[PDB]
Amino acid sequence: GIPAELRPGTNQFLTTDDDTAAPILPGFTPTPTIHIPGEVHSLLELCR
Amino acid sequence: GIPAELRPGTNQFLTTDDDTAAPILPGFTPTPTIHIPGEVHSLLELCRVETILEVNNTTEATGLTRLLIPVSSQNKADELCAAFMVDPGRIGPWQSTLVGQICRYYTQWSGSLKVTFMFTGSFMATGKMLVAYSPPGSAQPANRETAMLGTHVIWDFGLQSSVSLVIPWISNTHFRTAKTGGNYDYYTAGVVTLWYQTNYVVPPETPGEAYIIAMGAAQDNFTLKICKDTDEVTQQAVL
Amino acid sequence: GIPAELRPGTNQFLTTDDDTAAPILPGFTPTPTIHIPGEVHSLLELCR
Amino acid sequence: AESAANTTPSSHRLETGRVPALQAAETGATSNATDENMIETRCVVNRNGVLETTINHFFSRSGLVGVVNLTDGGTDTTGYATWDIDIMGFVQLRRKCEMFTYMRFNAEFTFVTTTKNGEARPYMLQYMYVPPGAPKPTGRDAFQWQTATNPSVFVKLTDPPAQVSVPFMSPASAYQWFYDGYPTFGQHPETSNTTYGLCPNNMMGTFAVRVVSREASQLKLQTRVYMKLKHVRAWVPRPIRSQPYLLKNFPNYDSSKITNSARDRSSIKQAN
Amino acid sequence: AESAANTTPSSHRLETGRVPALQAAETGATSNATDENMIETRCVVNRNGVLETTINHFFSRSGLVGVVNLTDGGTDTTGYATWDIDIMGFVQLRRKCEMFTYMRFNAEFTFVTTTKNGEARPYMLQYMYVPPGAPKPTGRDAFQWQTATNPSVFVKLTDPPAQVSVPFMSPASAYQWFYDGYPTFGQHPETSNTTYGLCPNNMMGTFAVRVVSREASQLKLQTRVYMKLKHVRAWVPRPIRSQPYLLKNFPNYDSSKITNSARDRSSIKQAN
Amino acid sequence: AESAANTTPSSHRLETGRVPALQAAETGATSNATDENMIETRCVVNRNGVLETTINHFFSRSGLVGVVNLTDGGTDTTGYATWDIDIMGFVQLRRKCEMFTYMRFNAEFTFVTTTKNGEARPYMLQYMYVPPGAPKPTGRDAFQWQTATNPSVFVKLTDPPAQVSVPFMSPASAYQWFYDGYPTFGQHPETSNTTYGLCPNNMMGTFAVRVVSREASQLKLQTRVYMKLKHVRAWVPRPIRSQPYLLKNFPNYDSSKITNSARDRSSIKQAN
Amino acid sequence: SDRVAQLTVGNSSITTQEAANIVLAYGEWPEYCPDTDATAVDKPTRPDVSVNRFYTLDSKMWQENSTGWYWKFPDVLNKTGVFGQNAQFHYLYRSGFCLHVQCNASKFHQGALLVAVIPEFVIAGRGSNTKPNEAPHPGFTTTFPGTTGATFHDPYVLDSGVPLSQALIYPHQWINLRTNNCATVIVPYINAVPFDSAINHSNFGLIVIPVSPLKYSSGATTAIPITITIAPLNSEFGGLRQAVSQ
Amino acid sequence: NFTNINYYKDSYAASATRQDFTQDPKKFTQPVLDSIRELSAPLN
Amino acid sequence: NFTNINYYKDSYAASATRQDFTQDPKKFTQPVLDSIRELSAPLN
Amino acid sequence: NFTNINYYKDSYAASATRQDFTQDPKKFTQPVLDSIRELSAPLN
Numbered sequence A, C: 001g002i003p004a005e006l007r008p009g010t011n012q013f014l015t016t017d018d019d020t021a022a023p024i025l026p027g028f029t030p031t032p033t034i035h036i037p038g039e040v041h042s043l044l045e046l047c048r
Numbered sequence B: 001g002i003p004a005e006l007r008p009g010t011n012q013f014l015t016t017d018d019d020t021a022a023p024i025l026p027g028f029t030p031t032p033t034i035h036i037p038g039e040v041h042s043l044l045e046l047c048r049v050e051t052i053l054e055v056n057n058t059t060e061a062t063g064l065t066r067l068l069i070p071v072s073s074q075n076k077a078d079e080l081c082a083a084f085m086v087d088p089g090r091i092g093p094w095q096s097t098l099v100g101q102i103c104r105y106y107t108q109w110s111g112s113l114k115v116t117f118m119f120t121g122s123f124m125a126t127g128k129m130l131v132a133y134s135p136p137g138s139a140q141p142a143n144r145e146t147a148m149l150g151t152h153v154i155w156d157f158g159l160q161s162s163v164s165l166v167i168p169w170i171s172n173t174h175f176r177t178a179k180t181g182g183n184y185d186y187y188t189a190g191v192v193t194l195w196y197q198t199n200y201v202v203p204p205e206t207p208g209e210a211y212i213i214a215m216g217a218a219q220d221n222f223t224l225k226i227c228k229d230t231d232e233v234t235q236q237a238v239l
Numbered sequence D, E, F: 001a002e003s004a005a006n007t008t009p010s011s012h013r014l015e016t017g018r019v020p021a022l023q024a025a026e027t028g029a030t031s032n033a034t035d036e037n038m039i040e041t042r043c044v045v046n047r048n049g050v051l052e053t054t055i056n057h058f059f060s061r062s063g064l065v066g067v068v069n070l071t072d073g074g075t076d077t078t079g080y081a082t083w084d085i086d087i088m089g090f091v092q093l094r095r096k097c098e099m100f101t102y103m104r105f106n107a108e109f110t111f112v113t114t115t116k117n118g119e120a121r122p123y124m125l126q127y128m129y130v131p132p133g134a135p136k137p138t139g140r141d142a143f144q145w146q147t148a149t150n151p152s153v154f155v156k157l158t159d160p161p162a163q164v165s166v167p168f169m170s171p172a173s174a175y176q177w178f179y180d181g182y183p184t185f186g187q188h189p190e191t192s193n194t195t196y197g198l199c200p201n202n203m204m205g206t207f208a209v210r211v212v213s214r215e216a217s218q219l220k221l222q223t224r225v226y227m228k229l230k231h232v233r234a235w236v237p238r239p240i241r242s243q244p245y246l247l248k249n250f251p252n253y254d255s256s257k258i259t260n261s262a263r264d265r266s267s268i269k270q271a272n
Numbered sequence G: 001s002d003r004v005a006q007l008t009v010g011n012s013s014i015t016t017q018e019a020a021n022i023v024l025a026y027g028e029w030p031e032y033c034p035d036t037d038a039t040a041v042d043k044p045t046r047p048d049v050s051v052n053r054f055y056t057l058d059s060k061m062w063q064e065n066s067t068g069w070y071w072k073f074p075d076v077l078n079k080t081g082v083f084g085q086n087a088q089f090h091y092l093y094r095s096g097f098c099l100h101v102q103c104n105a106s107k108f109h110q111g112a113l114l115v116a117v118i119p120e121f122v123i124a125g126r127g128s129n130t131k132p133n134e135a136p137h138p139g140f141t142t143t144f145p146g147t148t149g150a151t152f153h154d155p156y157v158l159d160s161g162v163p164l165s166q167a168l169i170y171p172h173q174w175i176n177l178r179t180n181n182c183a184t185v186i187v188p189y190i191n192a193v194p195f196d197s198a199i200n201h202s203n204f205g206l207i208v209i210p211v212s213p214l215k216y217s218s219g220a221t222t223a224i225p226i227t228i229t230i231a232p233l234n235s236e237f238g239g240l241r242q243a244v245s246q
Numbered sequence H, I, J: 001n002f003t004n005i006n007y008y009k010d011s012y013a014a015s016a017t018r019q020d021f022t023q024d025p026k027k028f029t030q031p032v033l034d035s036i037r038e039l040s041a042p043l044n
């Protein structure tokens, strides 16, 4: 079909890589979230 | 042409995968549909139908007399009738219902359940029965003054010969696993115990042994999640 | 370039498959059509 | 409805006339007594989903359907390996599908082929679907393998498993796994009714496979069929079988040696 | 029309003059008597499709066309393997295509090459199309294999089968499988008219193939040609042949040993 | 805020009453004395970024999680190789994850499989995830490997490593690595409390793997599990452990042979 | 005003004193075949007064060691009256059914019956043999019992390998001798084909199984019959030809 | 997020279409003609 | 669902185009000059 | 530059979404009720 071409970096597993993975449970809803006090967002909240 | 690149997950066959496949018959129209009554859309339409519990599943019983709870006239003022667990995905009376098999196909359940009793004795025989549900905690209650602290309903034998004890959802977490064994006793539901409220009184020239048929279904807040294989069939003969 | 992925059915030759093929003569015009009486369009014109 | 059900706040009642816990079961209907007409409940906004319990998410599983052996010998050879398309050969998908009376769906057949010892050597196979009424190929070098006016798939062993989509092709409006009748007229015997329950509306042809070569290939292959149901509609729900299966096209069970639907207990007045 | 035909509700008639069941066959026309001018019918809304019975969906099948052998020996070698492009070598597609007089279409030739014992070793092949009038390559190391101003395809055996598209290139406006004439002028003999029926408007050149190497390759390949018709238009429908084929470019049949179009029965007054 | 913090120009003060350097530490709060209420600073427009120090960029690392051995012998064979899904087997990701009390995230499990001597031969593997409550496969030819109503991945050794995405599936609202309680009721002993700290909200089933073949395959594989956290939220930050780990599900440390949090110096009145 | 009911179909009537509510199977009424779903071209016949009426079968004595009885409904009325005659001459058939099961007793008898319908109620052979030539199969009198009926051998598995407990998903009704003495089910035409032969295909079948055994004291009546009445509602016939028996 | 795109002329070769949340439970739970009220005796 | 897209400059290398539902059957069934009516005798 | 595109119906199978720059440090640094001023004695 589409005339594609491969480039270096193919078939490698980089650990620090943001990429969509295949889901194993289709149509799955998780447990609802509750309010837990003491939420962190960054690591400078602990340095201070 | 297009500079594409491959990523992990290539050339694998996932069974639970929605993807378009290649059609083998091009330009094919199927047989037109007709109207067939009794169409299902979800598996909660079957869970909301009551089904005869198997409470007398003990030994020394045949097949047909295995779904009946024997009721007689006790001489002592208070005795214990049949009792059973609430857990539908557990080995016991719930294994014989449709809701139990549907909960066996899944691994986690929620929502309230309904157990419906039915007196199939004589017309002249009267009496009152105490159907008491108890939340998790200790073991089966020993006497009635202990079991009457939970959720109970006084049911008298009148013109209407069926009571429906609702089993509320008193769990700490949202979902309970149907495993419920050994170290999984964290997800137990409780014990439903049927006690004798007053007695089973009977007039003369009348048999003094009746039976109660127990049914079970699920309420509207019943919820299932995470599909798995059942454990009712492990091997099979080559067909 | 484009992060593509292969799926089952690759490198098979289905006989009943509508797909564009590579032309061998580029820029070729065929012989013009004339009027021939007795043209068929479907196989129910012969069944009747 | 994307959620299950919310609960209305309730309270106690002290009055005569209203009896919501006396639902009669002799009428054939299910007790509609809720929690709000009983012990005092609270206001709960339930957001548990019901999407996974639907039929299209319940029948979207492949499962094993058929196992086809292909020896391709040198002195006791056959060449081809046909397989009647039926779902009753393995009791898992059969038990999952025989809980309804009438169904209608599509298929996503997938073929996983391995060797005897297990090895992917680059041998090209030919998967042929023979519709009901077409002649079956007799030999690895027969005339029917031309696949003119016949769909077939050419794939190797080192390639990914093949996967085709199959439409609804029954002459009736839906499939059926239980046929309470006979396929033809005539006098029916009393000794052995071997044609009872047979439904001609389910014979979906024959599936054949060979090895594309000239002389021979001393290798014993073993193909597996995985059929994924999709676009499925079911009617008239039927109870689930509690007895072990014995035959393919017949729901026969053991007269003696019966399996109880529930295991035995110590006593009836005991929960554990 | 996307559906076949709907039926009008009918009733009985008791009157003289109207005779719809007396259609004369001596006129050469087909009886146009419907069901509504006969036994009382009902109102049926037919939605059966007619898309599959069209010509483009009937000729969209590949089928086997040609089988080309390539031995490439060491002492009795030839190197190349030419194949005259004709459709009359295999009777399936020939029987499917000789039910019309004039046709016009495109092609989707596909080449499946296997070894003698059957094996995909990475040997690169060269498929050459020699148009009518061009010189044919004589040898695996000839001058014509340069493929300058000549289309050719380079592919290996481990690769998927090659597939090219071929336009309509007959000097006439359409093809023909039956030519009631002679190709040239002159006196024609009475003994053996071997040039009768020959149509120069169908010679589509020659197809050649070799193995791209330096010295030799002791391997006997066997290529198969699969031609998928597309964009097809047919004229003047002709009856289907009921006799077995005997030659390629001649519709000769057996004078004695004739094959009846229908098999024999027990009696004429018997349906079975 | 995309930058860290800018500095206001300051000057000297000569006045009584304002004491910004006398922040009391007995109140449990952190000293909020800035540089502008102290030694004379300047105007600095800081544009150093704070994006890398966030939690989603700190937990977006794979790390090693599990190592599963598969011998697949001929006389002392087992066939399968299960692995309890837990993160406490390797102290790197455990030390990185046990600095919080409650977490909630997704997973990007990746499986790298190698041979004993190290070699990628084209052997197809089957990675099965067994949820808690499902039966475990017992044997390389068991009934549970049908993977009906069970997710599994089919991949070879020559293929790239498999990678699936895993949602949040704990029955509680978040995970927890420290459970100050007991899993069930009853009398708890004084000798060996082996069930203390056990949290049933973390048992994520079992992971199994076999070799898809017929007879056997004399090869000792060794799979590695790499789990990439994503969409992570953490609560109640906990100090980092300064003692070496001793067990998997228990934070036990050495009573004697204690490791100081800081190394020793020559004297207290010496910086080097 | 709920315990009394008088059903009138044709020239028959059924009065009742002890009745529950009538059951409508799957919430669908039995009607005629529409032109959209139909497939035959010939016009079907509709007597509507000669085949649409209550036909009463025989009565069966409910004993104490009784297992249960069952029927194939398009095959029970295959020989009784104008309906059976009209069904023997025709090739196609489509109708619904109205049922009524009578079982009365005194106020000193106890027991319960489970009457329900099962679409495509396939009888299973009973045995432990897997060889094709000796595998047990039910005879023709077992598959199609006729106007008489057939008894159960293992009523706990419905003679089909499916448990009786889970058979409450079907359109069912209970006959509790302390509550009512009759049960009424109205079932429409349920099939995957518009029309079908009423000779070699039974659509559904009634089954009556005593869950609670019949008990009484010595001195009361001992003959407890089981009577069934069926009304073939909205009947259609097509394909007129010679009359065939079976 | 787009899985409603088909790649062929035939319609049966697609994936799972838009999910239907229809749930009629009353055709199995209460298949009765006289609608039994929630706060009433089912038989009088 | 799009198969009307060509990938080359030539037009014969495409796939099957839009289907034509034309069905003229009267040029083979009734190739006569005097149009025979449906309710009439074909010869008088 | 587009990594906000998902390829499946499920939402947990995507990549890292838009980053949140929220930084509340006062719930750990000054968890006190009486707000201590910057230029004042913390206790009087």
Ligand SMILES: CCCCCCCCCCCCC/C=C/[C@H](O)[C@H](N)CO
Pocket: B024, D085, D086, D087, D088, D107, D109, D127, D128, D129, D151, D152, D153, D164, D166, D175, D202, D203, D204, D207
């Ligand atoms: C090119 C090879 C394709 C291989 C698959 C064959 C295509 C035809 C499959 C039809 C799908 C039928 C699914 C089941 C049908 C009937 O219910 C069973 N035969 C009876 O259980």
Ligand SMILES: CCCCCCCCCCCCC/C=C/[C@H](O)[C@H](N)CO
Pocket: C024, E085, E086, E087, E088, E107, E109, E127, E128, E129, E151, E152, E153, E164, E166, E175, E202, E203, E204, E207
């Ligand atoms: C690059 C290799 C291409 C191989 C195919 C050759 C291209 C030319 C094919 C022309 C298509 C002609 C189809 C049939 C033509 C005439 O009817 C037959 N020769 C007579 O039966």
Ligand SMILES: CCCCCCCCCCCCC/C=C/[C@H](O)[C@H](N)CO
Pocket: A024, F085, F086, F087, F088, F107, F109, F127, F128, F129, F151, F152, F153, F164, F166, F175, F202, F203, F204, F207
């Ligand atoms: C198809 C094979 C997939 C293999 C991965 C299994 C999927 C289930 C993984 C659940 C992710 C759980 C991550 C950690 C959970 C608990 O915190 C640990 N068990 C305790 O440390």
